[PDB]
Amino acid sequence: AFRVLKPWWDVFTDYLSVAMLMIGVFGCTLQVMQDKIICLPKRVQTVEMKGLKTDLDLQQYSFINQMCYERALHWYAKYFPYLVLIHTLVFMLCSNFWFKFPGSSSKIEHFISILGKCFDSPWTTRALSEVSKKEGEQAKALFEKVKKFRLHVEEGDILYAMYVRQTVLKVIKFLIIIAYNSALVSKVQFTVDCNVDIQDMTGYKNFSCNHTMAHLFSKLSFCYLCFVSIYGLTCLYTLYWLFYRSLREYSFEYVRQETGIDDIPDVKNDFAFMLHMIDQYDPLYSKRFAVFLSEVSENKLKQLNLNNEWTPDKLRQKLQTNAHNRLELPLIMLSGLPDTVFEITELQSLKLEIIKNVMIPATIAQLDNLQELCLHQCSVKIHSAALSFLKENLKVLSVKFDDMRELPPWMYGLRNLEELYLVGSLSHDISKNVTLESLRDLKSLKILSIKSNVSKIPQAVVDVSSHLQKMCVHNDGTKLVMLNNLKKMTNLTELELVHCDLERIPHAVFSLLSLQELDLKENNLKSIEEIVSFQHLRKLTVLKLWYNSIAYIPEHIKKLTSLERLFFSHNKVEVLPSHLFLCNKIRYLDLSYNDIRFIPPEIGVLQSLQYFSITCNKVESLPDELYFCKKLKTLKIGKNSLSVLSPKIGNLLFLSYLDIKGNHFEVLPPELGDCRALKRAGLVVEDALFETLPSDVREQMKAD
Amino acid sequence: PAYRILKPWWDVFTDYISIVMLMIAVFGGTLQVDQDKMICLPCKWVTKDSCNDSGPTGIKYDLDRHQYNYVDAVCYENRLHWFAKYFPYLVLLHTLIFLACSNFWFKFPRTSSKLEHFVSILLKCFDSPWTTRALSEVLDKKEGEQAKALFEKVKKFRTHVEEGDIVYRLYMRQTIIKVIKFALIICYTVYYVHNIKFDVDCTVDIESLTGYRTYRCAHPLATLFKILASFYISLVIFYGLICMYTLWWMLRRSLKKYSFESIREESSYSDIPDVKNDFAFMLHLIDQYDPLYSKRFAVFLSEVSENKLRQLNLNNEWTLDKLRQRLTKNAQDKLELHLFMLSGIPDTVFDLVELEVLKLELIPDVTIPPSIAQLTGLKELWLYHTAAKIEAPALAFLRENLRALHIKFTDIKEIPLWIYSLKTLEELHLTGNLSAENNRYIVIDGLRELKRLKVLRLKSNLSKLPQVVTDVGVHLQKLSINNEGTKLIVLNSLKKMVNLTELELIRCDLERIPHSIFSLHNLQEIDLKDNNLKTIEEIISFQHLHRLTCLKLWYNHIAYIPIQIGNLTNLERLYLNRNKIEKIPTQLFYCRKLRYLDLSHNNLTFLPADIGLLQNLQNLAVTANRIEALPPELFQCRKLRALHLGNNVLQSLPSRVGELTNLTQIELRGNRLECLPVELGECPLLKRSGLVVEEDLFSTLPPEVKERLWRADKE
Amino acid sequence: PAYRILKPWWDVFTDYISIVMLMIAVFGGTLQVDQDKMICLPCKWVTKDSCNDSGPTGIKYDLDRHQYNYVDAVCYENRLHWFAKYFPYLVLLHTLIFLACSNFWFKFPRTSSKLEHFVSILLKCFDSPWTTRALSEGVLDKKEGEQAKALFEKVKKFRTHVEEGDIVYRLYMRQTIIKVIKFALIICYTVYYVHNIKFDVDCTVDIESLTGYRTYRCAHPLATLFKILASFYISLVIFYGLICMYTLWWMLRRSLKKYSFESIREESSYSDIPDVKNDFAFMLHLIDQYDPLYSKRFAVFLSEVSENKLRQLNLN
């Protein structure tokens, strides 16, 4: 479809060129045979008139005719048709100057294909009806094609320059043609005087000659002059339309006068010029193609596609529960957030995973039941009513910042927020994150878990220490430094530091006077010598120092007796001292997968113990005083070096769990029936140890 | 036309110039035929045979019109220069030669056929939707097959065209000839264009016929031929310049080497090879027309695109639904998938989450993608003649989930080096020879790293046992070595089998029992199959081993059982089949705990009564023996279920078989049972599937009993 | 078109030479019709009825224009050689005979029908996907399988139908022989009679009763132009004849009635392709002289092993 890009002046000049070709061909075929001159010598040698006798043969007459055709006839009168032919062929070749160069031709084909495809697209009519399924996907594909066309054509302006060069060439050629044709049109005359010197042949010197085809050539010259003048007026109008309006800028304000959409950008250079071309064809294509340009139309189409694909019944199918017993909607890799999601009002938690370029409307005010929000690796935007409502209502937040900007800056305008899950990663310039130190606006924050490679605790935590209570940090091989920021914790109760590479327990933990629990997970504690100040943590009941490297346990454990939970699983402890079990309030003691050589008898002091795990130890001797402690509910002694299960084991009335898996035992005693809370599941052992109960004991044990 | 794509801008420019040249030649020839003449006048005053040039009156020549015509013809033939006479024919001939040189490329049948094939496949690729998808990178079956067929056509076309360089050579020759012709045309035409004059003097010596010798003439189409030549020369110059540019375009770059470095850097497929000779030449010409065609044809050349298309087609050929239809179960009642003679593993396999037994059979050098981690229940893995290549997340999920690995091979390189890095491996059958140079148990030296193995089946034609297996045997509980008739050197190196419970020496050909067999207290299953025991004499030392419960001594050359076999009591599945026992003794029935007794293919003289000492016995197979009668004591046992008694010499079954209740399966094709006792129909658990019996003796029974059995079968 | 496949380089070269000679024949015929005359001036001085031809004044002949026209016509008809008058018509006739010899292969209904059948199923075998499948060495469509089986049976039937008689090869050999003999006769007579195309022609026609003169001297205007045309025609005929002798040497080099598929059976998997004979062998030699890919793609249908692979794959 190349004729669409041709306005009225282009086809008018083309048909003028065909007329010029006809005139030139007619003039040429006249000049080939009809063009001849007739010459008679001058001063030749009831009234009866007598003819003058020139005494010349026919051959001499032809010779005179030739001499006068060559040396007396003006060159214009002989070569006018060939000049017309050459000039109109140059006009025809330059008529498609802006059509033939392959880059411009590709641009023309691309633009006309795009304009025709969106012309056939019903999304234009749908959008025009809105302002005043499969086809939605086709419209989206055509829109991204339009954006690619914008990135491919608008930045250049070669087509306009080629058009202006072609127009200027046509105008200057028309000026030349009018000038020389008007100058030499008087030379085409009938009667000419020929003064060749052929006196030595014919006998005469002065001749009067007649160009037989001079009237016809004059009429043809005037007709060609008229056609050239019309062609030049057409080209002058083309140049005037080129110059008096700036065609490097196409304005869609005339569309804006009746169409409400105002985000439409104004295209420039090649796009502007060739849209002006399509306007010259018919303005309907331009005012219709306007709707395919703006971006808010694409956003509206995306929202419509999301609403169509996600019926509320599909959301009922998607409804599930989460880790905090809330109604969760898992939305995975979505284009956006549908309003159908907000139509659900029973919803208690929102899960948005990598749904980026998303703006939260006021419609979330529909669902009042929200308590948790999962904004995972998604850059989210906001609206004023959404800020107000999520300030009033939202309390639990769980975001993942794969990218720093994928953390949105508006989490911190809230106040009702209580739980925060800051999973992700961080760079070297930790203190520059002003996003962290805006939680001063948060008043209700109580849970903070930051799985990130955080080396320096921010001053954010220092500010929010008054109301914060729980820390969970997974550095994953990153050293944590600058522990004064954890010193100025005051009201914190829980601290779970994982892989922080803390060589020693800082004075930060002892500056805490109300810490309920401490975790020093994956932290290389080679020695524990700073426990002297641990007495200041009177609230400390949990010391989960597991997978650690504590080589020996000193007397400093006597500083705190309020300790209840004690996890030293996989520790480097060799021999337990006499000084652990003085703290009788301990109930929950773990030494799982350690390598203790043996258990000394001072374990008898721990009566209020309810859990004693030493599994996978090298312990060959269990003295009977741990069997004397009857309050010991759980007692895990698995995979040690022990020999025989104690026959007087039924004395432990409150022995809920006895993990003695993989121990080298011989025969189970019959007094497991006296044990009230020990099962085959509880007494996990190898099966050849399970097969050892007496038959009546099997009858009493299968019935428990 | 169809070959416009091959023609660059210079070729079409030369074509248009040649068309204009042909128009000029036609015009000049028309003028030469019609109105090209000479009209000559005699020189009246002549001195030394030259025009003397010595109111006014006309000069009288006294010449007729025919004498004038004769003078004109003779002075046109003899004294007009040949260039003025034959210039239109010369430009005609030159233009025809130029056109022939230009069209000889498309005229010559070999190059025309090559160009037609190239243009056809390029046009088919340009409209191929798979090309659009590859540029974009779920397809139709016919679309994928068309893409594969076009790929194969591209391969065979490349093999067809890269061998010869005739097309480029022909184009070079045509350009050279055009340049040389331009040079000659310019030289001769510029040399001879000055001879086209208007006034020519002719001295033809026709004084005998006319009366004059010298005449001065005038050529009408002289100064018109002087502009038609001068315009023609210009075109030739333009033609030559264009041709010269084409010649320059041959010399700066090598047309026989089209390097795809520019295309493969921009495109994702950075493995596009560089084409050569004629194919390179027409790809370069495609670039001169429009590079988009060559860019689109480039995706039908890379091998990565071929692999992607094969994977896309394989997802279509092997879908999740088809895999579920083919989904089967193994001997362990676990979900297995038998992929036999596959090119690879489709990702539809890996989209599963419930698969436990991934079986890979005869797949050439496959690469396992990480999505195996989605197969959450994956525990077994079967490698049969399959070189497996795996990555690290796969190794992670197999280190936390996979507890079985079944490797079958015929070569060392078929066995991958990753399989020794599993942290949950428990069951492991290596099938194929594991003894080689620097590789005898050093293929699999990472079996120390596997600390949870419990089953080790080795069909390896083995001659020795590694000590590391004995070290692993703290947790390993089953070792079955198949060697196809090769004796191992035990040398009492197996005593670390504390946890071994099933020592199964299949086709060991030992003929003796080493002390390590009856030193291992946890052994419960002992079958010395095909070991050619003429005598079994080592059962006495088994009483220190408290756990032996099943002596399946089958498929052996055992000639006789000593009566000391009566000392045992604790066996249940006493399978002494496929032997040469002369007779079963009463001592063997001192075993009270027997629940299963197989004595198939023996030389038993008869069946004694003490077979009825077996109350808990469930299946009994004394098949292929010489047995005539079943005693009533055998029928006091209420628990007989599977009585494979066929191909025997059984005379009759005594009516005390009515005491039997739990009979389930019996085989009686064979034997000598004259007629069916109705008690065989009395057995409730014995159904039509279990009562494999002759039909006539069944018909001898009353029809209503048969009807009752039928109604029990069908209701 | 459909017949361009069976036109080797010699055939297309002879066709282009033929249209070129047709063009020069048309040009010469137009020239003969329009501008072929001869200007005859009487010899005022005579000797034994021969042209003696022994301020100058032109010789007065006292002849009207009509007597001059009569002298022109009589000397043109009588004392101008028949070659210089009927050269373009002879060239046109020879060119028409050459074109008829070239195209009688396409016009005779038996040979034209055989050529059409061959071209048709060669195009169908090219369009057959099993050609690609066999040349590569999976899943078969029912319609594709039926088309492949029908094409195999058509190939077998046609091979049986045409291998019996070699009328096409015999006709092509006869056409080549006729063309080479025509070229020999043309070059002989044209070389002999080209020197009789002269400019100055002395005519003695005995019209003294009407004109008054006995002998005249004539100038043939289109004499050297006709001589140039004759030399051009001689060059074209020499080129045509050299091409025809090359074509005849192509016939006599090897038996075109016996085609051996040894190279293709060695390169391809199927090594049981029989050595076909006579008209099929000639027709395959022609397409081998155009493009060996046609034989490569068509040899798979002749072999029975490919049929064995066909029946196994169709069953699957």
- Shortest Cα distance from A293 to chain B (angstroms)? 23
Dihedral sign (CA A600, A601, A603, A605): negative
From C86, C87, C105, select the one nearest C178 (Cα to Cα).
Answer: C105
Separation of alpha carbons A326 and A63, rounded Å? 117
B438 in contact with chain A, both atoms CB, cutoff 8 A? no
Q: Residue C278 corresponds to which tokens in the numbers above? A: 């006579």
Instruction: Note whether B109 contacts C45, CB cutoff 8 Å.
Output: no
Q: Residue B483 corresponds to which tokens in the numbers above? A: 């060697």
Q: Residue B106 corresponds to which tokens in the numbers above? A: 């498309």
C8 in contact with chain B, both atoms CB, cutoff 8 A? yes
From A630, A663, A623, A662, select the one nearest A646 (Cα to Cα).
Answer: A623
Residues in B closer than 8 angstroms to A639, CB to CB, are: none
Separation of alpha carbons B440 and B458, rounded Å? 13
Give the per-residue SS3 of B47-87: CCCCECCCCCCCCCCCCCHHHHHHHHHHHHHHCCCHHHHHH
Dihedral sign (CA B165, B168, B170, B173): negative
Cβ-nearest to C45 among B65, B96, B208:
B208
Instruction: Note whether A203 contacts B57, CB cutoff 8 Å.
Output: yes
Cβ-nearest to B70 among C55, C136, C219:
C219
B48 in contact with chain C, both atoms CB, cutoff 8 A? no
What is the identity of the amino acid at B576? L
Interface test mutation site (partner C, options B44, B77, B114, B146, max chain C beta carbons within 10 A): B77
Separation of alpha carbons C218 and C204, rounded Å? 11
Residues in A closer than 8 angstroms to B41, CB to CB, are: 59-60, 63, 201-202
From A537, A115, A45, A86, select the one nearest A293 (Cα to Cα).
Answer: A115
Instruction: Note whether A59 contacts B290, CB cutoff 8 Å.
Output: no
Angle CA B659–B662–B664, to nearest 5: 125
- Shortest Cα distance from C53 to chain B (angstroms)? 5
Separation of alpha carbons A566 and B104, rounded Å? 96
Give A539's contacts (C-beta < 8 A, 6+ positions apart).
A493, A514, A515, A516, A562
Rg (CA), chain A: 51
Separation of alpha carbons B171 and B184, rounded Å? 20
Separation of alpha carbons A512 and B674, rounded Å? 99
Cβ-nearest to B218 among A67, A200, A204:
A67
**Reduced to 3 states, what is the DSSP secondary structure of residue A243?**
helix
Separation of alpha carbons A88 and A170, rounded Å? 11
Dihedral sign (CA A385, A388, A390, A394): negative
Interface test mutation site (partner A, options B41, B288, B477, max chain A beta carbons within 10 A): B41
Q: Which position has the token pair 């390029």?
A: B122
Separation of alpha carbons B496 and B509, rounded Å? 23
Which helix (H) or strand (E) is A296 found in, with range?
helix A295-309
Interface test mutation site (partner A, options B31, B57, B63, B524, max chain A beta carbons within 10 A): B57
b/e per residue A182-207 (b: at least 16 CB within 10 A): eebbebbeeebebebebebbbbbbeb
From C242, C15, C9, C13, select the one nearest C106 (Cα to Cα).
Answer: C15
For A18-67, the DSSP string reads HHHHHHHHHHHHIIIII--EEEEESS-------PPP----HHHHHHHHHH
Q: Residue B20 corresponds to which tokens in the numbers above? A: 């204009």
- Check if the beta carbon of residue A210 is closer than 8 Å to that of residue A195: no
Instruction: Note whether B63 contacts A59, CB cutoff 8 Å.
Output: yes
Separation of alpha carbons B227 and B253, rounded Å? 40
> Residues of A numbered 133-152 whose beta carbons fall under 8 angstroms of chain B's beta carbons: which are they?
none
From B469, B475, B471, B434, select the one nearest B454 (Cα to Cα).
Answer: B475
B172 in contact with chain A, both atoms CB, cutoff 8 A? no
From A191, A194, A183, A232, select the one nearest A212 (Cα to Cα).
Answer: A191
From A148, A145, A138, select the one nearest A305 (Cα to Cα).
Answer: A138
Cβ-nearest to B211 among C31, C43, C59:
C59
- Around Cβ A47, how many Cβ atoms within 10 Å? 4
Q: Residue C77 corresponds to which tokens in the numbers above? A: 């008809």
- Check if the beta carbon of residue B216 is closer than 8 Å to that of residue B43: yes
- Around Cβ A504, how many Cβ atoms within 10 Å? 15
For chain A, the chains sharing at least 3 beta-carbon pairs closer than 8 angstroms are B
- Check if the beta carbon of residue A160 is closer than 8 Å to that of residue A247: yes
Q: What single-letter DSSP state applies at residue A608?
A: S
- Check if the beta carbon of residue B414 is closer than 8 Å to that of residue B442: no
Separation of alpha carbons B301 and B299, rounded Å? 5
Q: Residue A54 corresponds to which tokens in the numbers above? A: 């020139």
Separation of alpha carbons B5 and A508, rounded Å? 79
Separation of alpha carbons C141 and C125, rounded Å? 17
Residues in A closer than 8 angstroms to B65, CB to CB, are: 57-59
Long-range Cβ contact pairs of C265-270 (< 8 A, separation 24 or more): C265/C299, C265/C303, C267/C296, C268/C134, C268/C135, C268/C296, C268/C299, C268/C300, C269/C137, C269/C305, C270/C134, C270/C299, C270/C300, C270/C303, C270/C305, C270/C306
Q: What single-letter DSSP state applies at residue A189?
A: -
Residues in A closer than 8 angstroms to B61, CB to CB, are: 57, 59-60
Instruction: Note whether B58 contacts A204, CB cutoff 8 Å.
Output: yes
3-state helix, strand, coil in chain C (%, to 5): 70, 5, 25
Task: Count Cβ–Cβ pairs < 8 Å, chain A vs chain B.
Answer: 75
For C223-262, the DSSP string reads SHHHHHHHHHHHHHHHHHHHHHHHHHHHHHHS-TTB---H
Cα nearest neighbour of C58 on chain B: B211
- Shortest Cα distance from C257 to chain B (angstroms)? 23
Longest dimension (CA), chain B: 174
Separation of alpha carbons B383 and B366, rounded Å? 11
Separation of alpha carbons A264 and C263, rounded Å? 69
Q: What single-letter DSSP state applies at residue B106?
A: H
Long-range Cβ contact pairs of A248-251 (< 8 A, separation 24 or more): A248/A157, A248/A160, A248/A272, A248/A273, A250/A275, A250/A276, A250/A286
Q: Decide: residue B87, CB within 10 A, 0-12 exposed, 13-18 middle, 19+ buried.
A: buried
Angle CA A626–A629–A630, to nearest 5: 130
Instruction: Note whether C63 contacts B66, CB cutoff 8 Å.
Output: yes
Separation of alpha carbons B183 and B484, rounded Å? 87
From A603, A635, A596, A649, select the one nearest A618 (Cα to Cα).
Answer: A596
Angle, helices C142-162/C109-127, rounded to nearest 10 degrees = 150
Give the per-residue SS3 of C115-147: HHHHHHHHHHHHHCHHHHHHHHCCCCCHHHHHH
Q: Decide: residue A211, CB within 10 A, 0-12 exposed, 13-18 middle, 19+ buried.
A: buried
From A282, A366, A369, A286, select the one nearest A325 (Cα to Cα).
Answer: A369
Cβ-nearest to C12 among B63, B76, B107:
B107
- The backbone torsions φ and ψ at residue C191, rounded to the nearest 5 degrees and listed phi first, read -70, -40
Q: Residue A276 corresponds to which tokens in the numbers above? A: 């002006």
Give B293's contacts (C-beta < 8 A, 6+ positions apart).
B5, B122, B126, B286
Longest dimension (CA), chain A: 180
User: What is the phi-psi region of residue B624: left when phi exceeds 0, alpha when psi lies from -120 to 50, beta otherwise?
Assistant: left
Angle CA A100–A106–A111, to nearest 5: 120
**Reduced to 3 states, what is the DSSP secondary structure of residue B711?**
helix
Separation of alpha carbons B658 and B81, rounded Å? 139
What is the identity of the amino acid at B170? L
**Reduced to 3 states, what is the DSSP secondary structure of residue A191?**
strand
**Reduced to 3 states, what is the DSSP secondary structure of residue B461?**
coil
For A487-532, the DSSP string reads HT--S--EEEEES---SS--HHHHH-SS-SEEEEET--------GG
- Check if the beta carbon of residue A653 is closer than 8 Å to that of residue A630: yes
Q: Any idea of the CA torsion for B278, B282, B288, B289, to the nearest 10 degrees?
A: 170
Instruction: Note whether A55 contacts B31, CB cutoff 8 Å.
Output: no
Long-range Cβ contact pairs of B589-595 (< 8 A, separation 24 or more): B589/B613, B589/B614, B590/B566, B591/B566, B593/B569
Cα nearest neighbour of B67 on chain A: A59
b/e per residue B289-317 (b: at least 16 CB within 10 A): beeebbbbbbbbbbeebbebbbebbbbbe
Q: CA end-to-end span of chain B, whole Å?
A: 81
Separation of alpha carbons A39 and A526, rounded Å? 130
C43 in contact with chain B, both atoms CB, cutoff 8 A? yes
Angle CA A35–A40–A46, to nearest 5: 120
- Check if the beta carbon of residue A339 is closer than 8 Å to that of residue A307: yes
- Check if the beta carbon of residue C58 is closer than 8 Å to that of residue C191: no
Separation of alpha carbons B580 and B534, rounded Å? 10
A369 in contact with chain B, both atoms CB, cutoff 8 A? no
Dihedral sign (CA B66, B71, B74, B76): negative
- Shortest Cα distance from A59 to chain B (angstroms)? 7
Separation of alpha carbons A624 and A603, rounded Å? 10
